[PDB]
Amino acid sequence: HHHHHMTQLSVNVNKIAVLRNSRGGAEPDVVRAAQACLDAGAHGITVHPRPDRRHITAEDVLALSTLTRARGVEFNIEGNPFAPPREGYPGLLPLCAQTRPAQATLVPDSDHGFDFERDAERLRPLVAELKAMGCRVSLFVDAGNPLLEQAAEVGADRVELYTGPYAEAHAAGDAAAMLELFATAARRAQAMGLGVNAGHDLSQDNLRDFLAHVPDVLEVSIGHALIGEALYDGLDATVRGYLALL
Amino acid sequence: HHMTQLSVNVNKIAVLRNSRGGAEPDVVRAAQACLDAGAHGITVHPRPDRRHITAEDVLALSTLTRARGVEFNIEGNPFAPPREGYPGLLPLCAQTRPAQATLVPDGDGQITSDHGFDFERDAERLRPLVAELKAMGCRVSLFVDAGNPLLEQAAEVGADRVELYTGPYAEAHAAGDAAAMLELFATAARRAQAMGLGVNAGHDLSQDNLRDFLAHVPDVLEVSIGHALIGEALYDGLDATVRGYLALL
């Protein structure tokens, strides 16, 4: 069996592209913002290129691949593996084929995980193809999923627990019920040889209780709350603040 | 004869909030941090499609600016009828009584404001709405292009100020040579002031081009800065960024 490893931080820069696209020019620069996050010591960059190009584009992915590669850090691409290519969107797997990121996080459409009764068989050859490229494959799952262990059956290397309902419980004050659930979910996955990532709605106000109660979380992908906190203190300070909690 | 004042446009803060669909980052808290750093007022532009700032944000920021004794500036299209989630500009201003109302021609679905009023077509539909805003206590500013040949008609319509659209200045400044644009905007300012109009400016103003603009365009009373201020704050934070802008006035 494995041994403990210090939790790593991946900065999700989707919202930086959201601000760019709202105006429609070039500021704020996605690569420049990611560069400042890696300069602050982040272990990697996460993006989620939607098929409709609402924020991050295929061009951003290639640009960020070149960046993370030149700096020896990890690139994590989220996306729906089932989405066929359309105009302006090459598809998740061909994007990973072109950039060979360290990790590919597979999502079903983010507010829920996969229905393994329904999607496991068209998932299987795509998971296998992603790993064959050199990608770790992580599957977005709900902490309450009774068939959660089936992600190992598909061949995935990790699961990413969707931490939405924990953060909602944390803001309301009583998050104990959520923490026992997410801890139990983490333990079930690890008993199958799966690594555990997390993120989504994780902030500087709730990360500490999470890592203190959920064991051996390997990687956290934090976007929204990190960008929102950076409005007050800057990207450099914010990332270093997150790092000091890992 | 008057210190140029900084109004922070907090639209892009709502851009970050609404994308998620919760409450963070809080628009009111961010505006509060801008005022603590010495900003002279808050600007918002509630669009009819509710892309970022909502009517509830307007009401909340009105209460904030009032408690802190600073000016509230609402940009918007006075012609836009009420839609789902949007009561319309004039009923919003009646409900909140902002110090200033900045009127733009912007149609539905424009990415951002990219042109000022065409006074040949809009002057007569502007007149009674300008008058109704003033009757509420609002100073009324009209978004105009620096090259508008009918710029002087904004005084005839009853507006108190014009806001020169600084987009083409910022584009020329980034390209290096902004002298020609600076003389044009200076000329536009003087034309407005000869009619008793005050001069505001904004759109695409940043920490890299504000200084030269105020240095050459005379008696600019107010600058409304949003997009670039929020983008620069991503690196340095709002307090530091706001204070940087104040030092450039």
Side-chain angles (χ1 to χ4, degrees), chain A residues 2-4 7-86 88-110 112-114 116 119-146 148 150-173 175-179 181-246, chain B residues 2-23 25-83 85-110 112-249:
Chain A
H2 281 284
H3 311 293
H4 180 271
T7 303
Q8 298 216 315
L9 169 78
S10 201
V11 178
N12 178 339
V13 301
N14 285 349
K15 298 320 159 170
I16 286 153
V18 168
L19 286 168
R20 180 191 66 193
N21 287 7
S22 73
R23 177 53 49 91
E27 315 307 323
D29 187 314
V30 165
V31 167
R32 194 205 164 189
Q35 209 167 308
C37 287
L38 301 174
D39 286 351
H43 304 106
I45 300 298
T46 293
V47 302
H48 180 174
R50 302 263 175 183
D52 59 31
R53 286 169 77 94
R54 58 185 79 165
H55 38 65
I56 289 289
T57 66
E59 288 71 22
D60 295 315
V61 169
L62 179 67
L64 290 169
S65 169
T66 302
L67 173 65
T68 57
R69 178 126 47 201
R71 305 209 93 210
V73 304
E74 281 194 347
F75 193 25
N76 176 42
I77 307 181
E78 300 185 358
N80 185 325
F82 306 146
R86 49 173 96 178
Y89 175 73
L92 179 59
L93 267 63
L95 263 184
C96 304
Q98 188 173 16
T99 55
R100 304 304 183 92
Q103 190 174 256
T105 303
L106 310 188
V107 292
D109 287 353
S110 310
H112 59 278
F114 277 105
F116 288 122
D119 287 322
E121 293 304 320
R122 76 157 306 194
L123 205 45
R124 165 128 33 212
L126 313 174
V127 170
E129 182 184 340
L130 287 165
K131 304 210 321 175
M133 297 178 315
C135 305
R136 293 203 311 272
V137 172
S138 181
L139 301 190
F140 211 66
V141 304
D142 314 289
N145 196 326
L148 186 153
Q150 262 181 275
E153 223 282 340
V154 191
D157 305 305
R158 301 186 177 183
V159 300
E160 180 167 328
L161 307 179
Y162 164 66
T163 53
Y166 158 70
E168 167 175 12
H170 200 266
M178 277 300 157
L179 282 171
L181 169 58
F182 278 79
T184 292
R187 279 185 292 261
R188 293 173 43 205
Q190 288 160 352
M192 305 288 297
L194 296 164
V196 177
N197 298 344
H200 277 102
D201 300 328
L202 286 189
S203 67
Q204 270 179 284
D205 305 300
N206 64 31
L207 182 56
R208 182 196 48 92
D209 284 334
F210 188 88
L211 305 181
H213 289 129
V214 186
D216 300 299
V217 177
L218 298 178
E219 187 198 79
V220 290
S221 313
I222 300 160
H224 183 62
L226 184 154
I227 310 295
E229 292 154 349
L231 279 175
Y232 295 90
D233 300 313
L235 277 173
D236 188 80
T238 299
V239 169
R240 297 186 198 269
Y242 275 91
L243 293 171
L245 288 173
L246 303 177
Chain B
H2 275 269
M3 320 274 298
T4 306
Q5 296 221 314
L6 167 78
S7 202
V8 176
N9 182 340
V10 302
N11 283 347
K12 294 315 161 167
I13 287 152
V15 165
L16 293 170
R17 180 189 65 192
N18 286 9
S19 72
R20 172 53 50 89
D26 188 314
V27 166
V28 169
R29 196 206 300 116
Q32 208 164 306
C34 286
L35 300 176
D36 286 349
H40 306 110
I42 302 300
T43 290
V44 300
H45 182 172
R47 302 260 175 181
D49 59 31
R50 280 169 75 92
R51 56 183 79 166
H52 33 62
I53 286 288
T54 64
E56 291 71 21
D57 300 319
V58 171
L59 303 183
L61 291 170
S62 169
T63 301
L64 171 64
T65 56
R66 184 128 50 202
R68 301 249 164 146
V70 303
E71 282 190 345
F72 197 27
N73 178 44
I74 309 182
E75 303 183 358
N77 185 323
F79 310 136
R83 294 166 50 163
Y86 173 76
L89 177 61
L90 265 64
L92 261 184
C93 304
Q95 192 172 16
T96 57
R97 300 302 189 93
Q100 187 171 257
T102 301
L103 309 189
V104 292
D106 291 353
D108 293 18
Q110 274 185 223
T112 189
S113 309
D114 42 53
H115 61 277
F117 278 112
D118 177 3
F119 287 122
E120 192 178 5
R121 72 178 294 258
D122 288 324
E124 293 306 323
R125 334 191 287 114
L126 270 181
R127 165 131 33 211
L129 309 175
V130 165
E132 187 185 343
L133 289 164
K134 302 201 55 181
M136 297 177 316
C138 305
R139 184 174 75 245
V140 172
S141 178
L142 298 190
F143 206 66
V144 300
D145 318 82
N148 196 325
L150 300 169
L151 186 153
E152 293 77 357
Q153 261 181 275
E156 222 280 338
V157 134
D160 301 304
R161 301 184 177 182
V162 301
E163 178 169 325
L164 309 179
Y165 163 64
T166 51
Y169 157 69
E171 166 173 11
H173 200 268
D177 197 0
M181 277 299 157
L182 282 170
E183 180 59 16
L184 170 58
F185 278 78
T187 291
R190 280 186 295 263
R191 292 174 43 204
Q193 290 160 352
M195 305 285 296
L197 294 164
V199 179
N200 297 347
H203 203 271
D204 295 328
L205 288 188
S206 68
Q207 267 183 282
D208 304 303
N209 63 32
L210 180 56
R211 184 62 247 141
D212 285 333
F213 188 88
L214 304 182
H216 285 124
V217 185
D219 300 297
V220 177
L221 299 177
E222 188 199 78
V223 291
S224 248
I225 299 161
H227 191 61
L229 185 154
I230 307 295
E232 289 152 348
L234 281 179
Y235 293 90
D236 297 312
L238 280 170
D239 186 81
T241 299
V242 164
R243 296 182 195 267
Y245 276 88
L246 296 171
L248 289 176
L249 302 175

